[PDB]
C-alpha cells in the first residue's frame, strides 16, 4: 500500500518504538514472524523459577519491565514510621505503620507464598521485611519483599542460562525431543500453591488420621507435611449405623470422603457457624477448636491495639485500615452468621493454603528465547553425557543437548548467534584468567567488548575507572567465576555476520571442542532457558467405573474440582470416524458386542464385571447375552411416543 511506501527507515532510525515484545529477546533482526509470535506466546506462558538468574546476553529492557511491573513486589510509597507489629500465625504477620509527613496510618503483611490462580503461584522472599523491627524508620525506595524473579539489586530474572550443545542422541532427539542432566533439572525448580476448602456439617465427622489418641488431628498442623497425599477425611455418621460403621474411628472406612493434595500447610482459615459449647464437648473437634481460639485471640489483640487509632476522629487512616479493622470487629462480635454462596451452612468450613516445590517431570516443556520449544524426553546421570576432556577446559560437561535435526527449517539463526557468542566469551574468560596483571587483563576484556559492543565498552571503562583497586580485583574475580555479560540490542545495534567473521579471523586461537570418544568436535555454549506450564499431568483422565448419568450411561463428575479424586478420570467418547475405522475390520458384530459390553447395556456390562472379577486372571473368557441394549429401548420409547413404531424386517 502507499502507507507501506510511507514508512521509512529514517523515520524510525535509532529508535525501537515500533517493537514491543521482542524488546525482551535479543537479535530480532534475523528471526521470522512465526517464531517471534511463538516467543511472545511463551513469554505469556512463562513460570516462576526457584533458582532464577539474569541472562548473560541482555537487552537493557529486562530491568525496565521488572521495575515498572508491580505484581512482584511492594515498594513503600513514601517514608513511613512503623508503630507496631502483630503476628497472626507462625508464618505470617502484619505491620501497623504511620506516614512520617502526612500523618496517616497504613498496614502491611507477610506470607510465605502468594496464590496467583489454581495451581500457579509463587513463594515470597520476605527477608527484607522480617529484618525490620519495632520503632524503625522505613525509606521510600525500600522494598519489603520480592519474588525470586528479582535479584539483590532488582535485576530481572525469568529464566536461567544452561550449557547446551547440538547433538542427536540414540535417535531419541527426533522431532523436538530434549534431554537434560539431573543437576540442571534439579535447578528448574518451580513452586506451586493450592487452596482447598472442606465442609463439616453436623452429620459428617472427622477422623484422627494424624497422631495418637491424645493428639487428635484430622489435618496436619502448620509445620507438618501432608502424608499419603491425603489432608483429611470424613465419615457420614448415621444414627442406625452407629454400632458398626462408626466403630474403629482411627481407621478409615471404605465408604468415606477423603481430600487429596500435596505439600506443606502454609495457612489455615476457619469459618464456624456453630456455638462453641458443642465444640467444647466435641473431642473429635479439638483441633478446630484450638485453631478457632488462636484466631479469635489474634483478632482480639489487633482490635485492642488499633482501637485507640480507629476511635480517634482526628487521625487519618487508609480505607484499607478501616476495612481490616471492621473485618476483625466483625469476627470478634457474637451472633455473626456466615452464609457461603448466598446460603447458610451448618457446622463449619475450613480452608487450607498449601505450597510445594516440583522438579522437572519427564515430559515437561522448555523453550529458549526464540520459540525453540520442545519436550523433556529423558533425563540421565550427567556422567552418561558428552563431555570435552582436552586442553585447558578438560572435563567440561554439557547439561542439555538440543535437536540438531534442522534449525534452518525453523527460521531462527539467532540461537546459533547466542551460542557462539557465549562460547567465545568462555574462551575470553580463559584467556583473561591466563593474564597475570590487572591492567592488561582489563585491557583485553575491554578490547573484546569493543570488538562486540563499543558503547557498552565505554560504560565499562567508566565503571572500572570509578572502581577502587581492591573492589576492582573483586570484580575481576566475579568475572572469572561467573562470566562476562554482553549487551545486545533487539533491532538497532545488534551483531551481524560480518562482525563474527572478523572475530573468527582475528581469534585464530579459537578451536572446536574435541569431545571424548565423539567423532565430531561439537560446540558447547550458554543459552537462556525458560520452562512453560503445559505439563503431562494436566491431561491424565482415566476411568474404570464412576458415576453414571440419568440415562444409565457414563458421565463426568465434579469430584475432581473438589479434590475428591486423585486423577481427573473423565471418560472418552467414540465418535464418527471411530466407529468407521473400527468397522474397517469386517467384525460389525464384534464392535457392537464391545459397545454393548462397555457402556450401552447395563446387564451386559454387569455380566462382564462378574465374569472378569473371578476366573483366571491371565485368561478372560467372556460370555455375552442378547438382552436389548438401553439405547435401543430408549429409542423405541422415542419412536412410540412420537407416534412412530418399531417393526424389524
Amino acid at each position: 500500500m502507499d502507507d507501506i511506501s510511507v514508512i521509512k527507515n529514517e523515520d524510525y532510525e535509532g529508535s525501537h518504538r515500533f517493537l514491543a515484545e521482542e524488546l525482551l529477546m535479543p537479535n530480532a533482526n534475523k528471526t521470522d514472524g512465526n517464531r517471534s509470535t511463538m516467543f511472545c506466546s511463551h513469554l505469556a506462558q512463562a513460570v516462576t523459577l526457584q533458582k532464577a538468574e539474569p541472562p548473560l546476553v541482555y537487552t537493557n529492557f529486562e530491568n525496565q519491565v521488572g521495575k515498572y511491573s508491580t505484581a512482584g513486589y511492594r515498594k513503600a510509597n513514601s517514608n513511613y514510621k512503623v508503630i507496631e507489629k502483630i503476628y497472626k500465625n507462625d508464618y505470617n504477620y502484619v505491620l501497623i505503620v504511620q506516614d512520617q509527613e502526612t500523618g496517616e496510618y497504613t498496614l502491611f503483611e507477610r506470607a510465605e507464598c502468594e496464590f496467583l490462580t489454581e495451581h500457579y503461584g509463587f513463594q515470597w522472599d520476605n527477608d527484607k521485611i522480617d529484618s525490620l523491627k519495632k520503632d524503625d524508620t522505613i525509606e521510600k525506595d525500600t522494598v519489603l519483599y520480592k519474588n525470586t524473579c528479582y535479584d539483590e539489586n532488582m535485576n530481572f530474572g525469568y529464566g536461567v542460562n544452561l550449557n547446551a550443545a547440538y547433538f542427536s542422541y540414540k535417535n531419541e532427539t527426533l522431532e523436538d525431543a530434549i534431554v537434560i542432566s539431573e543437576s540442571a533439572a534439579k535447578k528448574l525448580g518451580t513452586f506451586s500453591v493450592n487452596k482447598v476448602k472442606v465442609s463439616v456439617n453436623t452429620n459428617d465427622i472427622l477422623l484422627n488420621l494424624y497422631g495418637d489418641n491424645e493428639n487428635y488431628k484430622g489435618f496436619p498442623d502448620i509445620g507438618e507435611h501432608i502424608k499419603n497425599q491425603i489432608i483429611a477425611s470424613r465419615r457420614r455418621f448415621d444414627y442406625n449405623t452407629a454400632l458398626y460403621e462408626l466403630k474403629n474411628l482411627n481407621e478409615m472406612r471404605d465408604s468415606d470422603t477423603p481430600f487429596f493434595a500435596d505439600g506443606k500447610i502454609v495457612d489455615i482459615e476457619i469459618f464456624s457457624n456453630v456455638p462453641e459449647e458443642e465444640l467444647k464437648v466435641q473431642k473429635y473437634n479439638e483441633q478446630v477448636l484450638y485453631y478457632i481460639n488462636k484466631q479469635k485471640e489474634f483478632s482480639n489483640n489487633v482490635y485492642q491495639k488499633l482501637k485507640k487509632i480507629v476511635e480517634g476522629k482526628d487521625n487519618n487512616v487508609s480505607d484499607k485500615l478501616l476495612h481490616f479493622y471492621n473485618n476483625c470487629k466483625m469476627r470478634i462480635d457474637e451472633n455473626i452468621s456466615y452464609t457461603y454462596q448466598n446460603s447458610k451452612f451448618s457446622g463449619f468450613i475450613m480452608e487450607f493454603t498449601i505450597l510445594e516445590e516440583e522438579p522437572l517431570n519427564k515430559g515437561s516443556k522448555i523453550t529458549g528465547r526464540y520459540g525453540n520449544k520442545g519436550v523433556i524426553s529423558k533425563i540421565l546421570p550427567d556422567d552418561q553425557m558428552p563431555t570435552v576432556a582436552e586442553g585447558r577446559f578438560k572435563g567440561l560437561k554439557a547439561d542439555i543437548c538440543l535437536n540438531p535435526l534442522g534449525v534452518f527449517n525453523r527460521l531462527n539463526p539467532s540461537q546459533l548467534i547466542e551460542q557462539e557468542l557465549n562460547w567465545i566469551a568462555k574462551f575470553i574468560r580463559k584467556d583473561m584468567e591466563e593474564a597475570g596483571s590487572n591492567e592488561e587483563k582489563v585491557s583485553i576484556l575491554l578490547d573484546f567488548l569493543n570488538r562486540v559492543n563499543k558503547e557498552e565498552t565505554e560504560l565499562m571503562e567508566e565503571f572500572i575507572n570509578s572502581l577502587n583497586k581492591t573492589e576492582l580485583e573483586e570484580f575481576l574475580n566475579d568475572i572469572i567465576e561467573n562470566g562476562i555479560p554482553i549487551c545486545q540490542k533487539p533491532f538497532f545495534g545488534n551483531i551481524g555476520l560480518d562482525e563474527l567473521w572478523e572475530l573468527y579471523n582475528h581469534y585464530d586461537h579459537i578451536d572446536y571442542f574435541k569431545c571424548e570418544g565423539i567423532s565430531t568436535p561439537l560446540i558447547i555454549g550458554e543459552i537462556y532457558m525458560v520452562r512453560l506450564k503445559h505439563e503431562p499431568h494436566s491431561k491424565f483422565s482415566a476411568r474404570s467405573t464412576s458415576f453414571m448419568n440419568l440415562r444409565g450411561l457414563p458421565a463426568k463428575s465434579k469430584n475432581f474440582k473438589e479434590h475428591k479424586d486423585l486423577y481427573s478420570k473423565t471418560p472418552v467418547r467414540i465418535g464418527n470416524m471411530e466407529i468407521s475405522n473400527l468397522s474397517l475390520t469386517n467384525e460389525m458384530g464384534s464392535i457392537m458386542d464391545m459397545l454393548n459390553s462397555y457402556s450401552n447395556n447395563e446387564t451386559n456390562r454387569r455380566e462382564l464385571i462378574m465374569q472378569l472379577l473371578t476366573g483366571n486372571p491371565f485368561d478372560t473368557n467372556i460370555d455375552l447375552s442378547d438382552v436389548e441394549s438401553g439405547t435401543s429401548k430408549i429409542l423405541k420409547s422415542l419412536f412410540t411416543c412420537l407416534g412412530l413404531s418399531i417393526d424389524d424386517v
Binding site: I7, F18, K30, N34, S36, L497, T520, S580
Partner: protein
C-alpha cells in the same frame, strides 16, 4: 517389497519384516550417538574463507539500480539457491552428509536464510512492490520487518480457518461408502460392452491402472503393464466394479489381482479413507493455483452438474484427469468403486447389467445418493432427517433394505 513376493505374502514374513525394521532402527540409534551430527555457522564462515565463490555468493544483494520484475527475481533467487546447494554438496563441510541425505534440510528455507529473502504476498495475495533485498542471516529492514509480520499473521489466520474446517466431507463420504462389501466369486460374467473404455495420454494413467486386465487383440483380459508403452494413445475397455454383474457384491475378476490382498478388510472403507486423507491434506496445504483443480474435484463429487451433463465413461476419465492434476496418486480400482456406489439404476438386479444394453445409469448428489439408498438405517444416521421423518418427499416410509448399520440400530 520384492521379498513379500517370493515368500507367499505369509504372516511370518510380515512379522520378521517388522522385527528387522525395529532392529535396524536401534542400530541406527547407537551409531548415531557414536557419530556426531552437530551444526554451527562457523562451518559456513570457514567454507567462505576457503572458497571465495561461496563468499561473494552470500555477499550479494538485488541490483536495485534497475527495475526488477517478479518473474526475474524468482528466476534469480532460484538460480542462487541451486548454486548454494551445489557448492555446499561439492565441498567437504560439517553439514555435507546433512544435505546429501536430505533429512532435516529444506531447500527453500535454506535459500531464504542464506541468500536473499525475496518478495512476499499481501494478506489478499498480492506481491509487494518492494521485495526484501536483505537475507535472514544478514539482517532485516523495518519495512521488511512489517512484511514478515504480515506474512506470519496471514499464516495464522489461514491455520485458524483450516482447523475450523473440521473435516466435514469425510463424514458423509464414509457414511455412504462404508456398506460396500466383497463376494468371493470368480467372474461376474458381465457383457463385453459393459467394460468401460478409457483412453491413454500418459504413463500416469497406466500407474492408475495397475493390477488389472485389458482385453487384447484376441479379447482376452491380460494383465496391464505400467512399464509397457504400447498402450499410449489408445482407448481400451477395462472391467470395473461400477459395471460388475454380481448382485451379491463384487467378483474377484473386477478387483483384478489386487483382490487376494484385500480379502480381510472392507474394500469400500479403504477406498473412502485412502481418498479422503491425501486430498484433504493437499487442499489444506495449498490453502496454507493448484487449489483450483482440488475444488473442481470436490464439485465433481458433490455438485453433480457434470454427471447430469455426461456419461459414466466421460465422468471416470475426467476423474482420472482431475486426480492427475491434484498430484495425489491412488489406484483407479478404488475410484471405480466410488463410482459403483455412485451408480443408480431402475432395476436393483445386476443380471440385466450382464446383457447387451445396460439400464438407466443415472447418478445424483452424494447426499442425495445416500438419501436415495433404500435402506432407512443409513438414511436416519445422516443429516436432514427432519424432512425424511415428517414429510413424504423422500418416501422414507416406503423404502426398506438391509445394511450393516441396520444391525447397529
Amino acid at each position: 517389497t520384492t521379498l513379500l513376493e517370493h515368500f507367499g505374502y505369509s504372516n511370518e514374513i510380515k512379522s520378521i519384516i517388522k522385527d528387522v525394521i525395529s532392529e535396524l532402527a536401534i542400530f541406527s540409534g547407537d551409531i548415531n550417538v557414536t557419530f556426531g551430527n552437530t551444526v554451527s555457522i562457523k562451518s559456513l564462515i570457514d567454507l567462505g574463507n576457503k572458497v571465495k565463490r561461496f563468499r561473494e555468493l552470500l555477499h550479494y544483494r538485488l541490483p536495485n539500480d534497475e527495475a526488477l520484475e517478479f518473474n526475474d527475481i524468482e528466476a534469480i533467487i532460484k538460480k542462487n539457491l541451486d548454486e548454494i546447494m551445489k557448492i555446499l554438496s561439492e565441498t567437504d563441510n560439517m553439514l555435507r552428509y546433512y544435505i546429501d541425505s536430505g533429512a532435516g534440510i529444506n531447500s527453500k528455507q535454506f535459500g531464504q536464510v542464506l541468500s536473499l529473502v525475496g518478495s512476499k504476498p499481501d494478506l489478499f495475495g498480492k506481491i509487494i512492490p518492494y521485495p526484501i533485498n536483505t537475507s535472514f542471516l544478514r539482517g532485516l529492514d523495518v519495512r521488511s520487518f512489517y512484511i514478515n509480520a504480515l506474512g506470519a499473521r496471514k499464516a495464522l489466520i489461514t491455520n485458524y480457518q483450516q482447523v475450523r474446517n473440521s473435516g466435514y466431507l469425510t463424514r458423509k463420504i464414509s457414511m455412504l461408502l462404508m456398506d460396500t462389501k466383497l463376494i468371493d466369486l470368480d467372474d461376474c460374467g458381465s457383457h463385453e460392452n459393459n467394460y468401460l473404455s478409457i483412453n491413454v495420454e500418459n504413463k500416469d494413467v497406466l500407474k492408475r491402472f495397475s493390477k488389472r486386465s485389458y482385453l487384447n487383440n484376441n479379447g482376452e483380459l491380460v494383465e496391464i503393464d505400467i512399464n509397457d508403452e504400447s498402450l499410449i494413445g489408445q482407448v481400451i475397455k477395462i472391467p470395473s466394479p461400477t459395471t460388475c454383474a454380481s448382485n451379491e457384491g463384487v467378483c474377484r475378476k473386477c478387483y483384478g489381482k489386487l483382490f487376494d490382498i484385500n480379502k480381510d478388510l472392507n474394500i469400500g472403507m479403504i477406498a473412502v479413507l485412502l481418498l479422503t486423507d491425501p486430498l484433504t491434506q493437499r487442499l489444506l496445504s495449498a490453502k496454507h493455483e493448484l487449489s483450483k483443480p482440488l475444488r473442481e474435484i470436490k464439485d465433481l463429487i458433490e455438485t453433480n452438474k457434470y454427471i447430469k451433463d455426461h456419461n459414466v465413461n466421460e465422468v471416470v476419465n475426467y476423474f482420472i484427469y482431475l486426480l492427475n492434476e491434484s498430484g495425489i496418486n491412488i489406484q483407479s480400482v478404488h475410484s471405480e468403486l466410488i463410482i459403483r456406489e455412485m451408480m443408480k439404476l431402475d432395476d436393483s438386479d445386476r443380471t440385466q447389467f450382464k446383457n447387451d444394453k445396460m439400464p438407466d445409469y443415472e447418478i445424483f448428489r452424494i447426499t442425495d445418493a445416500n438419501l436415495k439408498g433404500d435402506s432407512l438405517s443409513r438414511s436416519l444416521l445422516f443429516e436432514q432427517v427432519k424432512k425424511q421423518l415428517t414429510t413424504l418427499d423422500y418416501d422414507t416410509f416406503n423404502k426398506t433394505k438391509s445394511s450393516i448399520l441396520d444391525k447397529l440400530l
